[PDB]
Amino acid sequence: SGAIYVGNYRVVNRHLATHNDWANLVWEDSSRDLLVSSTTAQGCDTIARCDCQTGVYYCSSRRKHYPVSFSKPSLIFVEASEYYPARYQSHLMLAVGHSEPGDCGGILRCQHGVVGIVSTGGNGLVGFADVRDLLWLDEE
Numbered sequence: 001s002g003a004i005y006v007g008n009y010r011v012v013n014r015h016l017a018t019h020n021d022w023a024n025l026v027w028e029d030s031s032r033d034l035l036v037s038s039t040t041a042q043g044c045d046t047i048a049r050c051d052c053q054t055g056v057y058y059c060s061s062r063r064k065h066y067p068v069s070f071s072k073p074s075l076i077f078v079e080a081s082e083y084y085p086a087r088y089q090s091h092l093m094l095a096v097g098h099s100e101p102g103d104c105g106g107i108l109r110c111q112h113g114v115v116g117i118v119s120t121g122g123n124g125l126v127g128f129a130d131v132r133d134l135l136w137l138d139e140e
């Protein structure tokens, strides 16, 4: 579990969005496993606007923050799960690291701010849904 709070927006994994998130929906994309909803309170996170490929992510299954190298956002095939059938997920970045399904929502960050959230994994590879291209998150 986990979310990004920037301005009057909440960014979560689409498969973990609540009824309030869908009722207050701003934007969602199944192929990215992302959903953004509106909030009443101002958020404190800053989205990174960069092409960093090094950062740190939080892994709830280890209660640890791991420094990683990660790939550029790309279209990657993702196996079937209880949430989606087998499909290609876009804007996904992989790193060599530990993750389990419940780790989705854990933030990946670089020196410039929030890069993305854990969304996929397995076989010692963790996958993050990129958010750096969503420039509108920085303005109302």
Ligand SMILES: Cn1ncc2ccc(CN3C[C@@H](C(N)=O)CCC3=O)cc21
Pocket (backbone or CB within 6 Å): 015, 033, 078, 080, 081, 082, 083, 084, 089, 099, 100, 101, 102, 103, 104, 118, 119, 120, 121, 122, 126
């Ligand atoms: C985060 N993580 N670490 C290992 C691992 C193994 C399997 C899965 C399966 N999965 C894929 C997600 C998607 N973005 O398609 C949806 C939710 C989900 O349970 C995730 C995993």
Ligand SMILES: [Zn+2]
Pocket (backbone or CB within 6 Å): 048, 049, 050, 051, 052, 110, 111, 112, 113
């Ligand atoms: Zn950066």
